Amino acid sequence: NDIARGFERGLEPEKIIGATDSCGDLMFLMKWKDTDEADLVLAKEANVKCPQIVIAFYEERLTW
Amino acid sequence: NDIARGFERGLEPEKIIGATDSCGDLMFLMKWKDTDEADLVLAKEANVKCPQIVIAFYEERLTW
Amino acid sequence: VPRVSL
Numbered sequence: 001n002d003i004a005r006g007f008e009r010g011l012e013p014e015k016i017i018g019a020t021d022s023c024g025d026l027m028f029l030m031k032w033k034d035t036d037e038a039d040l041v042l043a044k045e046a047n048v049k050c051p052q053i054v055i056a057f058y059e060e061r062l063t064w
Numbered sequence: 065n066d067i068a069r070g071f072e073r074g075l076e077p078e079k080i081i082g083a084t085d086s087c088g089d090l091m092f093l094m095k096w097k098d099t100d101e102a103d104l105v106l107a108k109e110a111n112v113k114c115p116q117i118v119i120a121f122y123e124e125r126l127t128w
Numbered sequence: 129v130p131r132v133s134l
Contacts, residue, residue, distance in 0.1 A: 001081060001093075001095060001100055001101070001102045002099075002100050002101045002102070003093065003101075003102050003103070005101075018086070018087075022082070023082065023093070029067065036066045037066050037067070037069075038066055038067050039067070040104075083130050122132050125130060125131050125132055126131075126132050126134060127131045127132065127133050127134070128133075128134060
């Protein structure tokens with residue numbers, strides 16, 4: 001199933017607010033700049049398009 | 065919701081392929097007719113727009 | 129993974 005197409009909206013990524021692997025490939029729920037909205041994007045694609053936003057997300061989840 | 069907007073695509077619902085309450089309000093991942101595409105829709109809205117599809121999903125996974 | 133428990 002073609003599920004995560006958030007980036008096709010042509011909006012600017014701001015912050016990842018959640019993540020799931022439950023449909024196969026790792027996805028992030030991406031909040032966009034200047035909106036309340038959010039949409040699933042594939043992680044592999046966010047890695048390339050918004051790597052600092054990906055990193056910031058993984059950073060606030062570090063556990064020991 | 066900020067997140068579930070699948071019905072705004074104006075495609076015919078065909079089958080629910082997952083569900084989550086992880087954003088408070090229950091959502092379904094809805095697959096549309098004659099495409100491999102799916103999108104999150106609010107359950108409250110699917111209940112009204114495609115009640116048989118909602119029920120068929122609940123029925124497929126009854127446990128005792 | 130949901131499962132309606134009755």
